[PDB]
A paper describes a structure:
The [name] (Spen orthologue and paralogue C-terminal) domain is a 15–20 kDa protein domain found across eukaryotic species from yeast to mammals. [name] domains form a distorted β-barrel structure comprising seven β-strands and a variable number of α-helices. SHARP (SMRT/HDAC1 associated repressor protein), [name], and RBM15B (RNA binding motif protein 15/15B) paralogues belong to the Spen family of proteins characterized by a series of N-terminal RRMs (RNA recognition motifs) and the C-terminal [name] domain. Here we show that the [name] domains of DIDO, SHARP, and [name] act as CTD reader domains that bind phosphorylated serines via conserved surface patches.
We solved the crystal structure of [name] [name] (to 1.45 Å resolution), which has a distorted β-barrel fold comparable to previously structurally characterized [name] domains. The conserved lysine and arginine residues cluster to a basic surface patch similar to that of SHARP [name]. Although [name] [name] dimers were present in the asymmetric unit, SEC-MALS analysis revealed that [name] [name] forms monomers in solution, which was also the case for other [name] domains. [name] [name] has a preference for serine-5 phosphorylation but also binds phosphorylated serine-2 and serine-7 with similar affinity. We modeled [name] [name] binding to an 8-mer CTD peptide phosphorylated at serine-5. In the model, phosphorylated serine-5 is tightly coordinated by the conserved residues K795, R834, and K898. Compared to SHARP [name], [name] [name] had a clear preference for double phosphorylated CTD peptides and mutation of the highly conserved R834 to alanine reduced, but did not completely abrogate the binding to 2×S5P CTD. This indicates that there might be a second basic patch on the surface of [name] [name]. Indeed, our [name] [name] structure shows a potential second interaction surface at a distance from the conserved basic patch comparable to that between the two patches of PHF3 and DIDO [name] (patch 2, distance to patch 1: 21 Å). Amino acids R847, R848, and K850 are potential candidates for electrostatic coordination of phosphoserine from the second CTD repeat.
Author numbering:
A (entry chain A): 7 to 93, 102 to 186
B (entry chain B): 8 to 91, 109 to 186
Amino acid sequence: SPKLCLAWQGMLLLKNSNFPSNMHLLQGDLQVASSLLVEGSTGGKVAQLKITQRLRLDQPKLDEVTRRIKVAGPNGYAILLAVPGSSAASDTATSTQRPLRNLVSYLKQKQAAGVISLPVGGNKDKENTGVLHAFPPCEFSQQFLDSPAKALAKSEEDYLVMIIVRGFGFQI
Amino acid sequence: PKLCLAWQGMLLLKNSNFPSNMHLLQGDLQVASSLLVEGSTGGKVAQLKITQRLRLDQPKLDEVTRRIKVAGPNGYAILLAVPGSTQRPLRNLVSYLKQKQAAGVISLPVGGNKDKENTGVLHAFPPCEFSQQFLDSPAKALAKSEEDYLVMIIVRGFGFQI
C-alpha cells in the first residue's frame, strides 16, 4: 500500500506560470526523492521545480520510462502523486500562480509529460543527477494508482504522477 | 515528512472488521510504533478492538486536549485512519460513531501491561469540529469526505513522559 508520505511541497513552474503542489510517495525509494528534490550545490530545500522540456506520451517513450525504472532498481527511483497545494519587481523570474488543474489540463491536451532535471542546478557527474517526468492522468499513469491512491486523486483533472529516476544504469 | 503510513490492519467493533490505514498527523511516531503491538511479544498486530466509548461532550474534549499537552512531545501521536468477523467499509464505523456521538477507545498495547508507562489509550474520533483541528491542508486531502476518516489520538502513560 502506498506510504503517502508528504515528500515535497512547493511550486511547479512552466514558463511564466506556477502551480502549488503537494507530492505524496506512491512507491519506490523515498530517499531517491529526498536526495534529488534539492538545490544541487547545497542539498538544501527548494521551493520551486521548473519544467524545462516535454516528453511525448507515445508508446515508445512510455516503454522507455518503464525500462529505466527497471534498470535503476528498487533504490534508484521514486514515484509520487502530485496534488493541488495551498494557494518583487527585481525578481528575475515572474510568474502567474494558477491551480494545478491548469497544468494538468495542458499536459493532457499536449499529450506530454513535463521534464524536470534534478537536482536544481545540475551536477558535473552524471551519476549524482536524476530526472523527474510529470505525467498527466492517462492509462499509463493510472497503473501506478491503487485504491488508496485514487482517494487522494479526487478527479482525473487534478493530479500528476511524478516518476523520478536517479543516475545512469543500475543504482548501487 | 508527515502523512506516512504507520499501521495497516483491521479495526474491530463487535462482530465487524473495518480495514484501515493509519497515517501520521502529529506527535511522536515512536509512540504509535511501540504501542501498536501485541504486548507479550512486542510484535505486529493485525487487529485493534474498540472496547469502550467516550462521549463527544465539551468537558471531555477539553480534557483530551489537556492530556495531549501534558504527555509531552514523546507522549502522544495523532494519526488519520482512512479506508484500507464480517468485513465492512470504514465508513460504516464512521457513521456508527457519528450517530453515537462518541469516540472509540482502544487500550494499548494489545493485552495490556503491568507498568503504566508502557501502556497507552487510543481514542478514535469521528469527523467533527474537534477532530478536524488536527488536519492541515495536506492532510485534509487524504481525509476525503466527512464520512470516510477517523482521527486516532494515542496518549502513552500518565502525565508527562520523561
